[PDB]
Amino acid sequence: DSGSETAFREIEIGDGFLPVCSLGPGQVGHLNLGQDVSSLRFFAICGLQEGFEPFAINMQRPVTTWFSKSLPQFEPVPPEHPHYEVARMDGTVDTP
Amino acid sequence: EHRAIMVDSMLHTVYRLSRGRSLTKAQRDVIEDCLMALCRYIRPSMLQHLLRRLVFDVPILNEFAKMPLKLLTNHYERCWKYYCLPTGWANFGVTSEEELHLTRKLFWGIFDSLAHKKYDQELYRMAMPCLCAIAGALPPDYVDASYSSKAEKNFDPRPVETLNVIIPEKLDSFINKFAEYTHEKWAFDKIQNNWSYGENVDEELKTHPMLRPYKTFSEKDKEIYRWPIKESLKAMIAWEWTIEKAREGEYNPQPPDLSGVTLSRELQAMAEQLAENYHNTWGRKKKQELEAKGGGTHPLLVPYDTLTAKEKARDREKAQELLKFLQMNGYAVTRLDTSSIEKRFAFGFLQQLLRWMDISQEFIAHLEAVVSSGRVEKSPHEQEIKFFAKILLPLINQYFTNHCLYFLSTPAKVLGSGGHASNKEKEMITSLFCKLAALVRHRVSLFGTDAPAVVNCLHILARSLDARTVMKSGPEIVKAGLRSFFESASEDIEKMVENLRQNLTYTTVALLPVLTTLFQHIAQHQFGDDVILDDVQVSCYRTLCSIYSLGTTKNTYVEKLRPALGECLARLAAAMPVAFLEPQLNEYNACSVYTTKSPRERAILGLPNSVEEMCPDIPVLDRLMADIGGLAESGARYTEMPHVIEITLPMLCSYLPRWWERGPEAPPPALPAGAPPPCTAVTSDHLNSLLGNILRIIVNNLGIDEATWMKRLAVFAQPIVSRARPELLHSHFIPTIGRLRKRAGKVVAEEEQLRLEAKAEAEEGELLVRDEFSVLCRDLYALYPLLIRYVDNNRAHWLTEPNANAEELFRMVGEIFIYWSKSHNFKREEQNFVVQNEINNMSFLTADSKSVQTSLIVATLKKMLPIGLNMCAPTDQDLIMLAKTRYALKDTDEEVREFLQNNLHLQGKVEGSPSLRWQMALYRGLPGREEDADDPEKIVRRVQEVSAVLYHLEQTEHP
């Protein structure tokens, strides 16, 4: 809205970054990471002259992805869970 | 929030200490500064009782209310998102409806007190921002709990005694029956509380231990609780609304008495009045004890209509259980059908501003009468005039500024976040605009100090008008009023024509800018199809004819006024929905008066039944195309043809773009939609020829100095430059940018000679070159914005397929850029021109698609950089950095070229670098790339030029 070309700026490198896309119900999207730079359209228009490099430009095997599986699976309660806490009280006497 | 109770009590006590009785001025200042500084940082929800106290006491408008209302407006301006936005203020929660109704009551109490009280500079000046802040903060779509609430007015709890008031027996039967019924329901609550209603007093149960059945219960000990219920019902019937049974006649009761359900809206409003009675009548004794104690207003003894929902429930529940007992028995309280829109904040304050609008019409009529009849300074409505001028005009300005999205919010396409304004709200806000226009029609002479305020406020009311829904399916009086106001404005423009050969001052400063803004709004929202028609279209016809006649006439005053006519007429062309420039195919257009009106209607309106007979003054669009083309060929300057550039160019640059969408080339939405042939036969070809004429006249007028309207000409050509033909670049921009480049090169050569000399003549020559390329800066700030949009459209085309002419244009703009970068005088004179002519704003809008720091030259260069960056191979990119270090050594272009020729063998290697593999493969995959570009001369040329561009870019970014 202010006219700045950069959407997000002053972003700390931190641990790293990964391409990601969250599709909704009945939604279809083609995620082209850039294994085939020829298949990367509009890259010459934006990115080629700016110095940007295709993601996985020289990677031989395709980049594996991780979909958010919706299957409800039991996992242990985190020790630092913000709301629920599990206490390991000792048996002592007259108590298990 | 953990222990906010004592924070609230601290706020209350600090406010009392500030409103103490024996304090010094400095001490009072310290207390008040603490209060504002504290409430600025605390959460707005912590003001639930301090805000209530302010609602109660600030409408007194005493000398002690200065800091109260100042802190009030500071807090509300801080948390305008907390109330107006339905989502709240981010992490902070959403406002309560109780707080919203406190805001409403506070706003209107301050307004009415400011109304009756006499004008005083301090209160009005320091309270108008407060009133605007409360009005803006409270959302317009909010509806109060009840429009017909109590609205009553240390507090005085009005004792409405009813023991003396007699009760008709036909209803007194169920008054006594409900007294017994509430005793039984009290016992039912006790037994429901796991404590069965005892018959003997015993501490084993915390509840009432002596609620015996009615047979064994003593009458007096019933009355201990029964008489309060009887007096409750007796007070409720003693008020003018008397509770009347529907059916004639009349230790647990069979029907459950629950206050959760609700009766009719009126019944709920005066049950709220009954709870206000529980406060006043039943706590006059409490107020006597409280005045004996000297503890200030007790929390319940605060007026009930302004009390917080959490603690007013103590009497709300009692009033509601009484009214619900009446409701399940069918009893109705006979004593108003207020619509939801009237109930709403928006339309209520709208009716009130209409009331003050007729009051101010009377006031200004009397003021004009006493101005005309001698000099009568004494005015019976002087307080009203001062109130209007100092409060009402800024208030409507600010309120319409912060809620213009709401008043413009179409129900079909919701624009306002809070909601959409009602149709009645839209129509009478349009009528308010028309009434303000009629008021200031000849009042512009008086209210001289407030005249700019009037014109800006009426600009705001001109913006955000649903002319669509008021003229179509809207009130006949209001639509006739606006149509007659446009007709009178057209007659006024004709009078203005006669004058060029108050009213003249009106047309000079108030009529024309507001008319332009109205046309601009109608053009943006494309409302003209159902708005600019019939008599409105006729009035616009005579307006355009008369201002064309004004353009024809040539005098000094009309020359100085021509920018206003050009802007106004461009906006009316953009809001004018019939192609009057296509008279032969006017039957195809369904918006014209001839097809909308019947033949009899045309006869009684005096219509010529043809566009040609309507306006033969303006020739056809082909004729003005030929005229502007001939003027371009002849090189018509502003001296030779000022009216053309001022007024007739807006015709083309406004009507032609918008009607290109109606032209044949633009694809129709459907075959039946396109079955009527387009009334305008315009395509992109005539648009492109119009750009050619504009470019030709600009380059011919480039040498002309003191040309100012050329900037607004560039602004007017900002939309036309889009959808430009590819050949237009080498047709027009390459020659004129070449001329600009060579003239700038001559100027910079003179500047270099000036720099090498150091005499007293060198200082005069320094001022001379400053003034010599100030015009160059103006010309570049004209031409380059046209290039910015042009490269924006064709950058994809040039990058997908390289154009040699595009590369040469890149070299041209890069040469201009290095000329601007090397010379310090260039940058300071550019900044001086920007600050002189306020170019920062228009540069900001030019950079915006669809600033002082921002350098147009740099921006243009960065946008065009990829075009002239793709011309070189990646192995040449592997030579750019050494050429940059050559330029870092401050060496000459000849030497950097020679030692680049020495480093011809120092280029990078594709098998050397893995990234060069894919970069070099893509550089081959470019369709316009062959192997002939690998010639060493071409390679060194492009390397040197690209490196010069990059080095001057990085020096501009980081000196």
From Swiss-Prot, chain A:
Tissue-level expression:
Detected in skeletal muscle (at protein level). Fast- or slow-twitch skeletal muscle.
Where in or outside the cell it occurs: the entry states: Sarcoplasmic reticulum membrane
Domain commentary: The calcium release channel activity resides in the C-terminal region while the remaining part of the protein constitutes the 'foot' structure spanning the junctional gap between the sarcoplasmic reticulum (SR) and the T-tubule. Pore opening is mediated via the cytoplasmic calcium-binding domains that mediate a small rotation of the channel-forming transmembrane regions that then leads to channel opening.
Q: What family is this? A: Belongs to the ryanodine receptor (TC 1.A.3.1) family. RYR1 subfamily.
As a miscellaneous remark, the entry gives: Binding of [3H]ryanodine indicates that the heterozygous channel is activated by Ca(2+) concentrations 4-fold lower than normal. Single-cell analysis of cotransfected cells shows a significantly increased resting cytoplasmic Ca(2+) level and a significantly reduced luminal Ca(2+) level.
| Primary role | Cytosolic calcium-activated calcium channel that mediates the release of Ca(2+) from the sarcoplasmic reticulum into the cytosol and thereby plays a key role in triggering muscle contraction following depolarization of T-tubules. Repeated very high-level exercise increases the open probability of the channel and leads to Ca(2+) leaking into the cytoplasm. Can also mediate the release of Ca(2+) from intracellular stores in neurons, and may thereby promote prolonged Ca(2+) signaling in the brain. Required for normal embryonic development of muscle fibers and skeletal muscle.
**What does the record note on quaternary structure?**
Homotetramer. Can also form heterotetramers with RYR2. Identified in a complex composed of RYR1, PDE4D, PKA, FKBP1A and protein phosphatase 1 (PP1). Repeated very high-level exercise decreases interaction with PDE4D and protein phosphatase 1 (PP1). Interacts with CALM; CALM with bound calcium inhibits the RYR1 channel activity. Interacts with S100A1. Interacts with FKBP1A; this stabilizes the closed conformation of the channel. Interacts with CACNA1S; interaction with CACNA1S is important for activation of the RYR1 channel. Interacts with CACNB1.
Q: What is this protein called?
A: Ryanodine receptor 1
Q: Which gene encodes it?
A: RYR1
